[PDB]
Amino acid sequence: GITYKGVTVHTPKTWHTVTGKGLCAVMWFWILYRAKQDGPVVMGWRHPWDG
């Protein structure tokens, strides 16, 4: 709770911020990890083993 001009904004609890940051970080890491594995495949640079 911080008041600038009358209005106050209740600071969120630690549990919410930690969970949101963790889920976002998991999403980003998963996207990059998938881009490492089959990123060239969707780009068309290399087939899995077709050719």
> What residues line the site for another protein (CB under 8 A)?
34, 42-44, 47-51
Per the DSSP assignment, residues forming a β-bridge with 3 are 8
Tokens linked to 13 = 């609890």
Contact call for residues 8 and 2 (beta carbons, < 8 A): yes
The residues near 24 (Cβ < 8 Å, ≥ 6 apart) are: none
Minimum CB distance to another protein smaller for 6 or for 50: 50
In angstroms, give the least distance from the CB of 44 to another protein. Answer: 4
In angstroms, give the least distance from the CB of 19 to another protein. Answer: 17
Minimum CB distance to another protein smaller for 5 or for 47: 47
